[PDB]
């Protein structure tokens, strides 16, 4: 690791600077370096890690979708043969995306999840594990696709079980986990009814717990509740 000689605190400081500069690849590299120092991550640090890689992989996913769409059109009846280039370049972006996902999954497995004992850390990391297997599933087409899907499902399910036992229904990590697991059901697992049920139950149970919250906590929880509602509106 090229960050091995940099202080942990300096890596975290530079991750925050990279964020302000919208340099998310740098941000991710700094936070990978910080994780590899071997200490547990604080709440702020976990979110720096997640923001960085979410932005990096999000851009890869958007590019992959553009190229996949072009590739699918090149294969319709009537298209002129353009050669191997569209497939090659889609494969290039795909392989880079898989590499980023494997990197994040590797950090979670060595050794963030096994040292995470508090609900807020363990659920956070298991959600990430589900998310990055979900991104692998989005591009998967081979002998391993079912197993990738089941790896996402299993991580999301463990996170869900912990979150229902240990966090209130308005907890933003619990809400975001449910939002994403619901999308997993709809888009990956071919289970739209499960997706809709999960989003609705999550929304309704959160609604009933809003009365316990401060104004600032209310703002955070209702933001994600609105995303649940947005998806329900898309799907119904």
């Amino acid at each position: 690791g090229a960050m091995g000689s940099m202080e942990r605190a300096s890596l975290i400081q530079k991750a925050k600077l990279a964020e302000q500069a919208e340099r998310y690849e740098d941000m991710a590299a700094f936070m990978k370096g910080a994780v590899e120092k071997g200490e547990e991550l604080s709440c702020e640090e976990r979110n720096l890690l997640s923001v960085a890689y979410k932005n990096v992989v999000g851009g890869q996913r958007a590019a992959w979708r553009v190229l996949s769409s072009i590739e699918q059109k090149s294969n319709e009846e009537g298209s002129e043969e353009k050669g191997p280039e569209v497939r090659e370049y889609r494969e290039k972006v795909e392989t880079e995306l898989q590499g980023v996902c494997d990197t994040v999954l590797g950090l979670l497995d060595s050794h963030l999840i096994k040292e995470a004992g508090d609900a807020e850390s363990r659920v956070f990391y298991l959600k990430m594990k589900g998310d990055y297997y979900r991104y692998l599933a989005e591009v998967a087409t081979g002998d391993d696709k079912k197993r990738i899907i089941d790896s996402a499902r299993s991580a999301y399910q463990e996170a869900m079980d912990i979150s229902k036992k240990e966090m209130p229904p308005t907890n933003p990590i619990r809400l975001g986990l449910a939002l994403n697991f619901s999308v997993f059901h709809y888009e990956i697992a071919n289970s739209p009814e499960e997706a809709i049920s999960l989003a609705k139950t999550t929304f309704d149970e959160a609604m009933a717990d809003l009365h316990t919250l401060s104004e600032d906590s209310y703002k955070d929880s209702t933001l994600i509740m609105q995303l649940l509602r947005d998806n329900l509106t898309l799907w119904t």
Binding site: G176, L179, N180, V183, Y186, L227, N231, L234, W235
Partner: peptide
């Protein structure tokens, strides 16, 4: 696409 966070 649907919303995730």
């Amino acid at each position: 696409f649907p919303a995730t966070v």
